[model samples]
Every structure is written in C-alpha cells, then in structure tokens.
Target: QMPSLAPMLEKVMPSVVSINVEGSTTVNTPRMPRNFQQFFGGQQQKFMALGSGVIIDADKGYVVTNNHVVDNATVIKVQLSDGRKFDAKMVGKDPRSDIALIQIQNPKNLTAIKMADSDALRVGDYTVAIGNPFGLGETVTSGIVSALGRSGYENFIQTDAAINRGNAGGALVNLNGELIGINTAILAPDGGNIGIGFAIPSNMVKNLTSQMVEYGQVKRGELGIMGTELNSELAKAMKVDAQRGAFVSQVLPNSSAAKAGIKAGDVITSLNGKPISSFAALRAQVGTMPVGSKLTLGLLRDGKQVNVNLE
Candidate 1:
C-alpha cells in the first residue's frame, strides 16, 4: 500500500464548501458629475465571484468564511462537496479579523469540520489546504506550517500550500484532518501562487465566529490604555527588565484598565498568563475578546511583578 492523504480527505471533504457571490458596487464615470450621477443610478455594477467556507456547525448550517468573501454581495450561495447547494444568509461579519459567519437557509446532513487546538500547532507541522479555487472545484494542496504569528493582529498561520484565489476562507487542517486555521491570504507578486499563504488561526476564528453566532455581531471591549511596542531604548527609559513587552504610556481616566490599577509607565508583560510581545500584540488580543471578559493583566511595575484584573 502507498502512503496517502486520500483516507483523511474522506471525512474532511464533506465539511469544506464552495461559495458563489453576486456582488454589487457603484463607481462614477467621468461622463457624469458626482451629484448628478446619484439621480441617474448609472454607476451601479454587478458581478459574480467565487470563494469557500468550512462548516463549523452542521446542524444549524453554519459556515464560516472571510468577510471579504461576501463583502458587498447581494447574494451568497454555498455548494457542498457532494454537490448539494443552498442559499445562505448572512449571520455577521467582523472586518478586524476578516471573519464572517453565514448560515444555510435549510441545511441537512451536513458535516462540520472538527476543530483543532491551534495554539498547540508548531512550525513544520504537516498541513493540508482544501479549497475551491478559480471556480473550478475543491483543490487539495499539501505543505508544512511555514510560520506562525505571521501577522500581528490575526496571529496568522503561514503555510506553503499553494493556496490561490478562491481558496480564501477554506480549511487549513493537520494530518489528523482537524481544522487548525481558516485559509485567508496568499502573497502573489507575480499573480501566481508563490507558496506563501496565510490563515486566521482556528482559535481566533472560533472566538470571533462564536460571538457572531451568539450576538449576531462581535462585542468589542476596550480597556482604554495606550502604549508603544517596546524597544531596548524604551525599555531602558521605562526601566523594564525585558526589551520586548508593551510599555504603557497612558491609562485613560476611569477606564477599565485605569480603574483596575494599571498605571502609566508599567509594562504589560503578559495577557491571560501568556506573554505579550508588544503593545500592538496586546491591543490586537484584547480587541478580539468580548466585553465583560475578565482578563488577567500581568504587569511589571517599580521593577516588581504584579497582576491586575481587567473587565
């Protein structure tokens, strides 16, 4: 018998679906002045596009995909691996995370991809990307986890899986056929897959999509703290022990962080017990958390270690 990925694809294929979008956009032509064009309705344009999604909740027909996939779309339709098609309705979209949730009007016998603990992933882990590409059909590509945390806000998973156009919002899974990330971006300077692709890690995807499912939108909370990414110079002036933490410069009055006892000049060393590399990292992490989330804020203050509770 030959070594193969065919066996794993059997269970996973049913969970990845194709998306078709009927999009509308308006652009003004030079023939009409901006104000006059509005009355004529002459700038509207319609087009069709292709994208992909992964089933997260099969019973309720929940499909998660990139926000851009359905952006400005007048209609969204999904096609399953087995050729079942359904009209989908928008659940919600969060642009910051590039995540959008949609549900099939009436779905049956759907298969949801089993999610993996994305935080457990490491670079060089074997990976498989399944997607609908170029309006053709589901395409399978194999690669390794090229890098993790490839982007600041999303903590994107970078892979070399030849993920091309229309692959966005598909599945980036491990050898066990568990979803680790949602395929999102590809770097193609020459308009070809250069083996550099990015995905929103499954953990973030789960968090954002769950909010959409619960509230029909993401509830973003703010701590009202401001700072800059730490550098050796800033670390020295701030008198911090490390050169790679977020140095707090201001804590807004009566804000959650301020009320929680966070002060200017303190360095945020960790979030929820995980080390935060920079202010941007901390800010991005907090932005994803829903309101009322009690976060453990690790601080370096007066050269001493302390922790604060944030609402």
Candidate 2:
C-alpha cells in the first residue's frame, strides 16, 4: 500500500524555494560589425538560469544551493512557495564541490529543513525530492536510493527519483522529511529525466556550506600524485598482488606523497585501512580532508604490502 506523502511534504515544502538568475556573457564570433571587426571581435549575450534551493538557517537567512545554479549571476531572485519573493545575495561559492551559499536579507519566520547524517543512509531507502522543474513551479517526486558513494569529487546519493531542469540545488528528503541530499544532476544521456538522478550527500553539503559561510571557500590537502585505477591487465603487467586499487603513475618531488615514500609504480590498496576501489574514490577521499591532516596509505610495493604516513 502506498502511504500518503502529503503529511510529510506539508512539513518540508515551506523550506524549499525557487531560484531565478540572470547574467551576461561575452563570446567571440566570426560575424562582427564592419567597423569593429578589426578592433573588437566579440558579441555580448545575455542568459538566464533557473533552479531551486533550500533554506537551512532561518535566523541567519542562509540558503544552500549549487554553485552551477548561480554561477556568474549578476542578479539572483528567490521566490517562496507562498508567492513571496526576495532578492538573494550570494554569500559564497565552492566550485570544486559545486555548492554555494546565498542569503535573503531579514528573513522572518521562514522554515528551515533539518539536515540528516548521509553516512547512515543505505540503498533502497525511500526518498522524496522537492524542487521546481521546467519552470512550471514546485513539484514532488518519490523513489528509493538507487546507489551511493558516487562522483570522484563529491559523495553522491543516487536516486531513482525524477529530477529535471530547474531541479538543481533542491532538496532530497527522507521519508521522515529530513534533508539528506541536494539534487545536482541527472544521468539521462538524452538530456531528459529517465528516473536516474544524483544528489550531493547532505554531510558534504553541510560541511561545505559551513566553510562557505565562514571562509567563503573550502580548504583541502593535496598529496601531489597522478594515478590511475589498477585493473586486471595492469595488475598482470605490474605483477602486483593487488588486483584493484589506485596505481601511482607519478609522484611529485618534495610533495607530501614523495616525503611519505610514495613512489611511482606503487599500487595504493587502501587509505587509513579503508579499501580504495578506484582512483576516483581515492581522489574524492583526499579532496574532502582538511589541510595538515595526517593520512596513512596502504600500498603494494614490488609485490609486498607497505604502509606510508603523510601529513
């Protein structure tokens, strides 16, 4: 039996808002004015992008949205479900994580959705998504967690929900109406909703948002290594014991990895004892960590297991 979502949505709908942004871009074109062709050879163009966002802090008037949503936006306008509108100000943005923080001045009595621990979410959990799709207005869709731990740069909660254009930066809530993720993209090759969508995990969103509000940017550590995933063919070629892991192709001199004794041709099997399945996963894990933090790497060196610590 299908349970009614009205009660749950009633609690969360107020926190979601529709976003409209306007910006201008300059592009080089072959067709230039005869007088200006020899001097200025570009045309001025204007663009408008629409998306959605969630109000996370009422007292501070803070709203969280995707960096892509408000990228280069000269004007940003936010409209609540109740038909109230406000001119939003860009607080900060982190393009690496694709998250942004915006604020409305003097917001009063606004609903803020509660963020959940995305690390505890599992596959098949029921998920409800709310956003503005196709500029038609607020819309809702339901599905289950299709996958997790996606994206090389960020952790994603993949869902079967129908997310489309204008849905970016909206809320992906649990059945209990807790915000668990932010709709960032869909996997449809044809550029239409095909029931496969991806959301940035709420944990990452919370962390990035806090940093954005505090420092206006995210700080991350770097090991300075170019690597690739070790496959069966590579494992055979390298004659290493590990079949799947990140294989170091180059180690920058004087970098943290070089100082820690990480060398080229070494296969990284794990980090801090957690297995690394691919190079993308390894990069993502390292990207989220703070600078000056220590990391322990498990590596396959000349067909032997070795551990290296770096700060």
Candidate 3:
C-alpha cells in the first residue's frame, strides 16, 4: 500500500504546538572595585528559545515539554496548528530532568494525543514526525526514536542566538500518532538515521507528571542500583572481549534490586528481556517506572546468565 502519514499527522498536529519562550540569564560582571560589586552584582541577559509541547490532557489543557524549553522563561507563548495562540504558565517540572508539565489556562477545543505504552515499544517500531519541528508550518516536526528505554539527556545552550536546531520539547509518536515520549535531544541530521534519537517514555512522563500534580514536586521511581557503562577496561577486567551492557557496581539496601539479590560486580545485560546498552540506559529504565511495576533483569555473574524479577 502506497500510504502516507499525513492523515495521522494532521490529527495530532494540533496537539503539539510551536512554543516561543522569553527569559533572562544572569551574566558575569567585569571586575570593578569592591564598591562596584554593590552597585551592579551582575547583569541579566535577556534571551529566548524556540521549542514545542505535546498536549497530554485535552480538558485539563496540560501540555508536557522539556524544562529547557521554558527555563527562566518569564513569558511563554504557544501557537496551535491552526494558528491560534495562548499564553501558558509553568505548572511543575521534574527534578533536574528536562521534563516539565504546563497548563494552558482556560483552554477549550483541545485534543490530547493518545499515549501508547512506551514500555511495550520495541526495537523495530517505525517512529514518525516531521523533522526540524521548530518550524512554524503544517510541516512542524519530524519524530525519531532509536535508542530504547533507560535513556539520558543533556540540554545544551548555544549563546543567546538560542537553540535554532533544537526540538527541545516536541512529540515522539508512532505511525498511528500515539504519544511515546517527549523529544529531549537532537540527533540524526538530514533524517539519515530514520530510527535513532533521544526519547523519554510516556510511562516516564506520566509518573513524573503525576507526582507533580499530587505533591507539587516531581519524584522519580528508582530501583536503588548504581552502575557505569561497560567499557574496554571494564570488559577486560570482567573477562569479556566485547563492550556492551552496564557494569553493576552497586545495588542499594532494601530496594527491589537488592531484594532480587543482584549484587556488586555483576553486569546487568538486559531489562525485561531487552538488551540494555549502558548503565545510563538501565538507570533510565528503572527511574521512570512508577515504583510498583515489576520487570525482569538479565544479569551476568561469573560468566553465567541469571534472570531476576522484582517490583
């Protein structure tokens, strides 16, 4: 079938909007005498960033995005697909991560994008979205999702010229336009790598958002484990010739990982039967889960495979 994604894209287009942010950053003061310090401690450099947001709840008008999109933002303007606009205010944000949940005050005629179980997303699934999403057009954003659960994100700042190439807070959706996660990183320029980029699952988004709604703060669900990426040196020490998976350095007290009996020096090779590439991925996987969810972990200890389950 010579099908196109336009139909699905059209439906979800209204859910992800162009976000223009206005904020200020404090800058260094030229060294003047001590007396000058009292006069001007520092200067606030006005700046703005361009990004996007996914409407998670239509009636509540809740749009989730990256904190970097709205950081220090004194003003936020969200423009819908049809060119209507609204001024949004910050609701809450996750602890140190890029995820932030905001509400469109007095919203109407909104459509919340459906969220698929990102926990169920697999390696070969086709991710669809218009690339270069910051553009204000019918062709707003393209989506990408290659790396799987247990991901990492670092928001970069490129002068006051702002993040021209950054998607910052766009949507990661399936071909059906179901929400997967928030787009937190920029990768694969020119769409060469069709299935690779940064993503945080909706399961992750929901947990953090729920915590903020209930407690006025973001609290991530963690399984009490610590580790590092498997590198050449670590692989050599572990008697493995290949660099893959995470080196389990420590499993904390009384948590699910500890209760499952995984210990120090063991390597975590998988999560729920899926290959976990690095410690960053494993930690990302556990922290996003909402505390009581149970899953299997594949481990390597003494050159043998072990399967452990915990909640």
Measured by lDDT, the strongest candidate is 1
What is the overall TM-score of model 1 with all chains considered together? 0.73
Cα lDDT tens digits, model 3, 181-299, are 66565442121122334656677677668766676666555654755466645444764544466787666754655676777677777766678777778777766754334456777
Runs in model 1 lying further than 4 Å from the true structure: 30-42, 150-154, 164-169, 186-195, 225-311
**All candidates' TM-scores?**
0.73, 0.71, 0.63
Between candidates 1 and 3, name the one with more favorable lDDT.
1
Most accurate candidate by TM-score: 1
Residue 231 in model 2: lDDT: 65
Clashes of 2: 0
Which pairs of residues collide in candidate 2? none
Ranking by TM-score: 1, 2, 3
Per-residue alpha-carbon lDDT of model 1 for 141-165, expressed as tens digits? 8899988873212367888885544
Among all windows of ten consecutive residues in candidate 2, which has the lowest summed lDDT? 185-194
* lDDT agreement with native, every candidate: 0.76, 0.75, 0.64
lDDT of 3: 0.64
